[PDB]
């Protein structure tokens, strides 16, 4: 079994030894250079259809926390933009920092945000998530930057349950959560082909990164930083800086949905 994490001893600089694809041709995240991303008129409109989303549970997995959805039917889907066909929402999670000047995985002209939200979707033509991650177009991850300012009211139900999943392996019931409350006003985005940003680092993701960040309060992100990487009863290791740094772009072009 693997023992990867975000520390000096097991952090992103080490991952390549158990996961050689870490040094691959389409790794994530990347720096988005706004002055070399080109507007693409071929991109179709982005369609976020979360009206029927059914959240079930929230889990501390020792790396982040996942809010899990019922993906047994097309209840919450992402379509359009660069995507062919229908991608089903399975979970969302965040990456965040020890301080407000770091935490995001993607950067914008080398700017790091306080955190980044990932809404993870799988291509329904592959029938299940485990099959989809074996395909170069298997997943679509919608990435949203968080900056510290005004509170995000639609985030507070997540903040308030974190006390109940402090340590690795803890879960709580988390029904009737509406992920539409986490979106910014604008769906303007950048898109590029990439990877999972954690082991197993599979090159199966179409990244869609929204240009407009959402604002959350200092108090909201301080509550993320009280989570633990460790299990119950173990020495406390605060769950902070669970982000992978920007990886080489190599032979890829980032496309913008907007002028
Ligand atoms: C157990 C579990 O949670 C997962 C299992 C998998 C099993 C096989 C491939 S993944 C999973 O979904 N991993 C994941 C999802 C999104 C991102 S990211 N930061 O690129 O959005 C990173 C990791
Ligand atoms: Cl900004
Ligand atoms: Zn992620």
UniProtKB/Swiss-Prot annotation:
EC category: lyase
Regulation: Activated by X-ray, histamine, L-adrenaline, L- and D-phenylalanine, L- and D-histidine, L-His-OMe and beta-Ala-His (carnosine).
Phenotypic consequence of residue 61 to V: Reduced activity
Reported effect, residue 61 to T: Reduced activity
Effect of residue 197 to A/C/H/P: Strongly reduced activity
Modified residue annotations for Phosphoserine: 1, 164, 171
Protein name as catalogued: Carbonic anhydrase 2
Impact upon substituting residue 64 to F: Reduced activity
Outcome following mutation: residue 196 to E/H/R: Strongly reduced CO(2) hydrase activity
Cofactor binding description: Zinc. Can also use cobalt(II) with lower efficiency, but not copper(II), nickel(II) and manganese(II).
PANTHER family per record: CARBONIC ANHYDRASE, CARBONIC ANHYDRASE 2
Modified residues annotated as N-acetylserine in this record: 1
Family: Belongs to the alpha-carbonic anhydrase family.
Job of this protein: Catalyzes the reversible hydration of carbon dioxide. Can also hydrate cyanamide to urea. Stimulates the chloride-bicarbonate exchange activity of SLC26A6. Essential for bone resorption and osteoclast differentiation. Involved in the regulation of fluid secretion into the anterior chamber of the eye. Contributes to intracellular pH regulation in the duodenal upper villous epithelium during proton-coupled peptide absorption.
Binding site for Zn(2+): 93, 95, 118
Disease named in the record: Osteopetrosis, autosomal recessive 3: A rare genetic disease characterized by abnormally dense bone, due to defective resorption of immature bone. Osteopetrosis occurs in two forms: a severe autosomal recessive form occurring in utero, infancy, or childhood, and a benign autosomal dominant form occurring in adolescence or adulthood. Recessive osteopetrosis commonly manifests in early infancy with macrocephaly, feeding difficulties, evolving blindness and deafness, bone marrow failure, severe anemia, and hepatosplenomegaly.
Phenotype for residue 61 to D: Strongly reduced activity
InterPro entries: CA_dom, CA_dom_sf, Carbonic_anhydrase_a-class, Carbonic_anhydrase_a-class_CS
Outcome, altering residue 141 to F/Y: Strongly impaired activity
Gene name tied to this protein: CA2
The enzyme's E.C. designation: 4.2.1.1, 4.2.1.69
Site feature Fine-tunes the proton-transfer properties of H-64, where: 6, 61, 66
């Amino acid at each position: 079994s693997h023992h990867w994490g975000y520390g000096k001893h097991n952090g992103p600089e080490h991952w390549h030894k158990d996961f050689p694809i870490a040094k691959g041709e389409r790794q994530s995240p990347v720096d988005i250079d706004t002055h070399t991303a080109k507007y693409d008129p071929s991109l179709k409109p982005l369609s976020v259809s979360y009206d029927q989303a059914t959240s079930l549970r929230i889990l501390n997995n020792g790396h982040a926390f996942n809010v899990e959805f019922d993906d047994s039917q097309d209840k919450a889907v992402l379509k359009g933009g660069p995507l062919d066909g229908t991608y089903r929402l399975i979970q969302f999670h965040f990456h965040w920092g020890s301080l407000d000047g770091q935490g995001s995985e993607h950067t914008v002209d080398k700017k790091k945000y306080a955190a980044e939200l990932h809404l993870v979707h799988w291509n329904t033509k592959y029938g299940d998530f485990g099959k989809a991650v074996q395909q170069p177009d298997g997943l679509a991850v919608l990435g949203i930057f968080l900056k510290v300012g005004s509170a995000k009211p639609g985030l507070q139900k997540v903040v308030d349950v974190l006390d109940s999943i402090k340590t690795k392996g803890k879960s709580a019931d988390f029904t009737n959560f509406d992920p539409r409350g986490l979106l910014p006003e604008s769906l303007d985005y950048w898109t590029y082909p990439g990877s999972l940003t954690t082991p197993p680092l599979l090159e199966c993701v179409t990244w869609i990164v929204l240009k407009e960040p959402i604002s959350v309060s200092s108090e909201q992100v301080l509550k993320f930083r009280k989570l633990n990487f460790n299990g119950e009863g173990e020495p406390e290791e605060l769950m902070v800086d669970n982000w992978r740094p920007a990886q080489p772009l190599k032979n890829r072009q980032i496309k913008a949905s907007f002028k």
